[model samples]
Target: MNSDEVQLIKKTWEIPVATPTDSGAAILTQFFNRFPSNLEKFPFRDVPLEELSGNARFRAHAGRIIRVFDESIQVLGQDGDLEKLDEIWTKIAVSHIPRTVSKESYNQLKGVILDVLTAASSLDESQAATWAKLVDHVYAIIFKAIDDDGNAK
Candidate 1:
């Protein structure tokens, strides 16, 4: 991404999480608090925001302003390949095993991305759209992989 692109992303992608109902802000907050990694953030860490936030690693990754959200976790890719995204998702999904990661985790992540995109729209119209598409595309692949094998017992 160029300086202009970064600017656009920075300007537009705000991280205003939704409220309790129909919002995944809580889960997002929790995920970051537990494991702070670029490749995979928690899916439903928001389920219990306080517990996850209490973890040692949360502060390291959250609120760094990477990729366009005020508080966000980013998964990076140069080329959009379903396989790569799937691989990343597989890692995340399996990590939840014996701990029980909820399918609701996907919903929370989607909400977070949507919220980020909405914030981004405030910065640059075209760039926001591009970012939204990119996020959606990556999310779809990741979600599919999680569905396929993440919940296995």
Candidate 2:
């Protein structure tokens, strides 16, 4: 990301960080709801959807998502080359490899995240467009790692 876009992402992200739980939970809720089958991929697979918001396990997992995201944003401000971001990418890739996270879910997640960010922050289309670029960049790397992990060395 360019210097301007790093600032733009951090600035646009502040509101969501303010109430990270709600924003993060909101994204997961929408995602699992829209892609109900994906729920089976999570530990809370048996838990009913309407009751999810109050579930501790669900909430904790949701919060973790936001925190990791915040970490990546922080790395952007501290380093231009994003060495730390590469580490973050490696961990996420390794973690998801065994779970067999679906390739399509990556796309689903990006769309749901964009929608959540737009609605939760009330960002204008131009601002959301910037986020879309970041999201696309992140997911593209993640999916590539996941696919490579499955194939022969």
Candidate 3:
């Protein structure tokens, strides 16, 4: 993504507030409800429930990518297990889940991630670069989903 695109994405991610139903907390809660085992993944696997909520940043950010671009970011539902995740993708045909992130929720999340990156970029060039890389990473995942033959399921 170009600098302008990066700024847009960052701006979307950093929304200060969210609607009651669409709050980060609520989304995380829904995720946990849908896939309780998902919490076992993450870097802070052993962290408390309270801490797990904070980790929702990644999910929220990914949701935003799906929203803004109107594309699946990836099959993150595999819960971070590379092997199992691959298996899930295979069933879908594309080796990835397309449109796994709901369209409505993704729109909200993307706006937030965009805001975050825009603010961070102003603070430091490295920060901007990081956001750029993030955009690329997100794009790669989406590409995989679209190309994956398993997505139909």
Estimate TM-scores for all models.
0.44, 0.89, 0.28
Q: lDDT by residue for model 2 over 1-153, one digit each (tens)? A: 678878988988899989977998898899999998778877889888998878888898789878988888887756453677777866776678777776777677779888988987788888888888877766766766766433211
Model 3: CA > 4 A from native? 1-22, 55-153
What shift in Å separates residue 117 of candidate 2 from its native position after superposition?
Answer: 0.7
Q: How well does candidate 3 score on lDDT at residue 144?
A: 56
User: Which regions of candidate 1 fall more than 4 Å away from where they truly are?
Assistant: 1-27, 30-55, 60-83, 124-126, 148-150
lDDT of 3: 0.44
Query: For model 3, what is the error of residue 20's alpha carbon versus the real structure, in angstroms, after optimal superposition?
Result: 9.4
Q: What is the lDDT of residue 7 in candidate 3?
A: 54
Give per-residue CA lDDT, model 1, range 63-113, as digits (tens).
322312332223233354345556655665565554454556545555555
* CA error at residue 60 for candidate 2, angstroms: 1.9
What's model 1's overall lDDT? 0.46
**lDDT of candidates 1 onward, in order:** 0.46, 0.79, 0.44
Candidate 3 C-alpha lDDT tens digits along 1-153: 455644544454444233322444555544554455554534444656655555655456435523433222232223453444344433433422443433223334344544454553353665555555654455444445443332332
Cα lDDT for residue 129, candidate 3: 58
lDDT, residue 124, model 2:
87
TM-score of 3: 0.28
How many pairs collide in each candidate, listed in order? 7, 0, 28
Model 2: lDDT of residue 92: 77
